[PDB]
Amino acid sequence: MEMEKEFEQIDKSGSWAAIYQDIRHEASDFPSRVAKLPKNKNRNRYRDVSPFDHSRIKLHQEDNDYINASLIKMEEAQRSYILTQGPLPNTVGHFWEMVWEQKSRGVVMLNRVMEKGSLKCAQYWPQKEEKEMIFEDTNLKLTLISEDIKSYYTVRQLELENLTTQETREILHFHYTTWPDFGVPESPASFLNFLFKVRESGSLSPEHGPVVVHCSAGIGRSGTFCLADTCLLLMDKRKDPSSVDIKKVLLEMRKFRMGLIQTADQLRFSYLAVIEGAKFIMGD
């Protein structure tokens, strides 16, 4: 069923809450035993948001390999994403170790460091060229190279150096800065524009490791970003673009990380972004 018609049918019936609950009910449940070990309690921002054991990213160190991060592997779309929480004061070194080890090109950040008067994630990148950051626990150095501030998002060019081998890499930071403190954006125009800038960069392409995507918990806004990208890619690839079922793509993605799309409003916003992005697709 053409999702645009499914959309009006749910909107006119105001059933968004009922669809969302159907998804919650059918979603996969897999063990998260590593995440719940007592040694890992300070590595988790939220007690109810954990990576599944089967899909968790492992850090390459014998001490403790745990990070709150999952690999979302979309077989038919041929895209992979790492979804993670906003780093904590004690996990900023782990975060950059993961970026290095997984060969990521891009980091996508969908939150502000402070929102609703509380800290949503650590200040994990340098704000001034001449004040670089050193992560002593993981032996990495990170320097701000350049910053492009726009009305709805900022792009930063960063150098990550593995101090053990003196190899360096270019890391692009895509920072969506205008998601509102409550609800979802009214128009998906600026969010789609942002997604197309990440794509244009090469960050989502198979020649690099998976893009690292985060918000505060790494399930809500983060879930919207990867669901819209995968759905629009499948509409490009298939003979019948109307076959793309957003609810079935979301349940496939929920096999890899729990709780992706946190509200009925986020589900509705995901439909809108795909419907409008297709509009700027069918003939753009």
Binding site for ligand T1J (CB under 6 A): 145, 159, 168-170
CB atoms within 10 A of CB 187: 11
Catalytic residue among 121, 215, 226, 231: 215
**Inter-CA distances, 167 with 119, 129, 277, Å:** 33, 19, 39
Q: Are 262 and 182 in contact (CB under 8 A)?
A: no
Cα–Cα distance between 154 and 147 in angstroms, integer?
7
Residue 231, annotated as binding a ligand: no
215 is catalytic: yes
Q: Are 216 and 85 in contact (CB under 8 A)?
A: yes
How near is the Cβ of 145 to ligand T1J at its closest, in Å?
Answer: 5
How near is the Cβ of 127 to ligand T1J at its closest, in Å?
Answer: 17
Residue 22, annotated as binding a ligand: no
Taking phi first (over 0 means left), then psi (-120 to 50 degrees means alpha), and beta for anything else, what does residue 202 get? left
Q: What torsion, rounded to 10 degrees, do the Cα atoms 138, 144, 145, 146 define? A: 150
Residue 218, annotated as binding a ligand: yes
How near is the Cβ of 208 to ligand T1J at its closest, in Å?
Answer: 13
CB atoms within 10 A of CB 264: 17
Q: Which is nearer to ligand T1J, 130 or 181 (CB)?
A: 130
How near is the Cβ of 155 to ligand T1J at its closest, in Å?
Answer: 13
Residue 221, annotated as binding a ligand: yes
Residue 47, annotated as binding a ligand: no
Q: Are 278 and 241 in contact (CB under 8 A)?
A: yes
Residue 217, annotated as binding a ligand: yes
Closest-approach residue to ligand T1J (CB): 170
How near is the Cβ of 181 to ligand T1J at its closest, in Å?
Answer: 33
Helix-, strand-, coil-residue percentages of the chain, each rounded to 5: 35, 20, 45
- Which helix or strand (DSSP H or E) is residue 119 part of? strand 118-119
Q: Which is nearer to ligand T1J, 161 or 229 (CB)?
A: 161
Residue 171, annotated as binding a ligand: no
Q: Which is nearer to ligand T1J, 6 or 159 (CB)?
A: 159
Strands (E), 123-252: 133-135, 140-149, 153-162, 167-176, 211-214
Q: Which is nearer to ligand T1J, 123 or 168 (CB)?
A: 168
Quick one: angle between helices 246-253 and 221-237, nearest 10?
Answer: 120
Structure tokens at 95: 């975060």
Mark the binding-site residues for substrate, compressed into ranges.
181, 215-221, 262
What residues act catalytically?
215
Mark the binding-site residues, compressed into ranges.
181, 215-221, 262
